[PDB]
Amino acid sequence: GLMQFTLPVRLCKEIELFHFDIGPFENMWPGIFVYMVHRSCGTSCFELEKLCRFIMSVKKNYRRVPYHNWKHAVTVAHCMYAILQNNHTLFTDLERKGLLIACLCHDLDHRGFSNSYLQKFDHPLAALYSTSTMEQHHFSQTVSILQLEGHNIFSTLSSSEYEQVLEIIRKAIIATDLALYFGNRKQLEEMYQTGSLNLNNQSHRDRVIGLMMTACDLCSVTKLWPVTKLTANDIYAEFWAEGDEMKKLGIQPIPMMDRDKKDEVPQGQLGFYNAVAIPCYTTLTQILPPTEPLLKACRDNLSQWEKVIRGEE
Ligand SMILES: Cc1nc2ccc(OCc3nc(-c4ccccc4)cn3C)nn2c1C
Ligand SMILES: [Mg+2]
Ligand SMILES: [Zn+2]
Numbered sequence: 001g002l003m004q005f006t007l008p009v010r011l012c013k014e015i016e017l018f019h020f021d022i023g024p025f026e027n028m029w030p031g032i033f034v035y036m037v038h039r040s041c042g043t044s045c046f047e048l049e050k051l052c053r054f055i056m057s058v059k060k061n062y063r064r065v066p067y068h069n070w071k072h073a074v075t076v077a078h079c080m081y082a083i084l085q086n087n088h089t090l091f092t093d094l095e096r097k098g099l100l101i102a103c104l105c106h107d108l109d110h111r112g113f114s115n116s117y118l119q120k121f122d123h124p125l126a127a128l129y130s131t132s133t134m135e136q137h138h139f140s141q142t143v144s145i146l147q148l149e150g151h152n153i154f155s156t157l158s159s160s161e162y163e164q165v166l167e168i169i170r171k172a173i174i175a176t177d178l179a180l181y182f183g184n185r186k187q188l189e190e191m192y193q194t195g196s197l198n199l200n201n202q203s204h205r206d207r208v209i210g211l212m213m214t215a216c217d218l219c220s221v222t223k224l225w226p227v228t229k230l231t232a233n234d235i236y237a238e239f240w241a242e243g244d245e246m247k248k249l250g251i252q253p254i255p256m257m258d259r260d261k262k263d264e265v266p267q268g269q270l271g272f273y274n275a276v277a278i279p280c281y282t283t284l285t286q287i288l289p290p291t292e293p294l295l296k297a298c299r300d301n302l303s304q305w306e307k308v309i310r311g312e313e
Contacts, residue, residue, distance in 0.1 A: 001043070003048065004038065004043065005031050005034050005035040005038060006035075007031070007032070007035055011023075011028075011032070015032065015035065015036070015081075016082070016085065017082070017293075018079065018082045018086075018219075018222060018291075018293045018294050018297065019222060019223050019224055019227075019293070019297055020078060020082070021075075021223060021224075021227050022071065022074050022075055022078060026070070029059075029074040030052070030055050030056070030059070032078070033055060033074055033077060033100070033104060034048075034051060034052070034055070036077065036078060036081040036100060037100055039081075039085065040081050040084050040085060040096055040100055041093075041096045041097055041100065045096070045097055046097075046153045047153070047155070047156075049150070050150060050151065050152065050153050053150050053151055054145065054151045054153050055104070057148060057151060058073070058104055058105060058108065058145060061108050061109050061141055061145065062107070062108065062109070062110070063109065063110065063111060063112070065110065065111065065112035066112065066234040066235075066237035066238050066241075067112070067231075067234040067235050067237065067238045068107045068110035068111075068112055068238065069110075072107060073103070073104050073105070073106070073107060073108075074104065075219065075220070076103045076104075076106060076107075076216045076217055076219065077100050077103035077104045077216075079103075079215065079216035079219035079222070079294075080099050080100055080102075080103045080213075080216045081100060083212055083215070083216070083288065083291055084096060084099065084100075086288075086291060087288050087290055087291075090199065090288070094157075094161060094164050094165050094168060095168060095209070097165055098165040098168035098169050099168065099172060099209065099212070101142075101153070101169060102142075102168065102172035102173055102213070103172075103213075103216055105138060105141070105142040105145075105169070105173065106135075106172070106173050106176045106213070106217065107134075107138055107176070108137075108138045108141035108142055108145070109137060109138065109141045110134060110138070112238040112241060112242070113134075113238075113242050113245070114134075114242060115132070115133040115134055115177070115179070117242050117245060117246065118133050118134065120249055121245070121249065125137050131177075131179075132174050132177040132179070132180065134177075135173050135174050135176055135177045138173050138176075139169070139170050139173045139174065142169060142173065143166070146166075154166075171206050171210065172209055172210070172213050173213075175209065175211075175213040175214065176213050176214070176217050178214070178217075178276070180210070181211075181214045181276070181280070184207055184210045184211060184214070185211060185214070185279060185283050187207060188207050188208065188211055188283050188287065191204065191207075192283070192286050192287060197287065208287055208288075211280065211283060211284055211287070212284065212288075214280050215280055215281060215284045215291070215294060218276065218277055218280060219294070220232075220235070221272075221273065221277045221297075221298050222281070222293075222297040222298050222301070223297065223301075224297075225300070225301060225304045228301045228304070229304070232265070232269070236259075236262075236265065239256055239257045240258070240259035242257050243258045243259060244259070255268070256268055266305055266308045267309065269305040269308075270302070270305055270306070270309070273298065273301070273302040273305065274302070277298050277302075278295070278298055278299065278302065281294045281295035281298045282295060
């Protein structure tokens with residue numbers, strides 16, 4: 001009860017910043033997460049023993065893939081911690097509890113393949129979940145782990161509070177399907193620009209939490225350039241493996257996933273920054289002004305990809 005987690009000085013200070021990198025020491029990531037729950041939520045949010053047991057079972061159900069791994073889970077949770085800490089009073093007690101858990105669980109049991117590849121392979125998951133195939137799976141794995149003996153971190157919530165947190169988590173995880181992001185952000189854009197955006201409207205809060213989820217999920221584009229650039233290598237390691245698997249089914253993959261077309265990575269990143277990332281962090285900064293450092297870091301990284309195209313690196 002009187003048992004705080006503390007981090008070395010450099011981590012204690014830098015964990016508060018949006019651009020923090022959790023480091024290569026995998027054994028410190030559980031402690032980094034508990035630290036973030038304790039400051040984001042309270043030392044009373046969860047029973048330490050149950051929380052530690054839940055975190056370790058979550059870790060075990062992430063696979064050893066290049067990008068969609070346990071380091072991604074914790075990295076996405078840290079970006080959410082930073083958003084929550086920079087917007088103290090905007091979020092309910094249930095939201096603070098649900099959202100870091102949602103982030104840690106959002107890619108549970110990912111295999112490193114897109115929803116498209118599962119549909120083309122005719123994977124059993126594509127028949128069970130016809131849209132947002134992997135995201136429905138991640139939510140199903142989250143509920144599984146919550147139901148293991150000694151893993152109910154929400155045990156002290158009422159029946160209706162438990163149902164509300166699991167609904168915050170389900171929507172937060174589904175929103176990480178990028179196919180859903182474009183429309184969500186366009187509706188947020190219209191609501192903000194016509195002044196209809198209302199944070200007391202639940203369907204509005206849902207959209208705003210969805211956009212937060214996209215922002216945390218893409219937060220590799222908000223790091224210092226050496227982090228962004230090295231993470232890109234892991235992102236493509238997966239895409240190119242999916243491309244190989246498309247070729248094995250006798251389907252030419254899109255260029256993004258074709259390793260023969262590596263040369264065009266720099267221009268592919270520009271499109272991504274301009275069509276996805278910048279719009280994401282722009283709309284987020286309009287709704288939640290203290291998230292502006294994410295947009296500034298994204299713009300700094302777009303400018304570094306522009307330098308790569310100009311052969312200046
Ligand atoms: C965090 C993060 N999440 C994602 C999701 C997708 C993505 O895609 C980037 C891209 N490369 C290409 C490309 C590359 C080589 C040859 C031709 C086209 C197209 N496109 C969209 N980048 N990305 C990042 C950076
Ligand atoms: Mg995902
Ligand atoms: Zn993710």
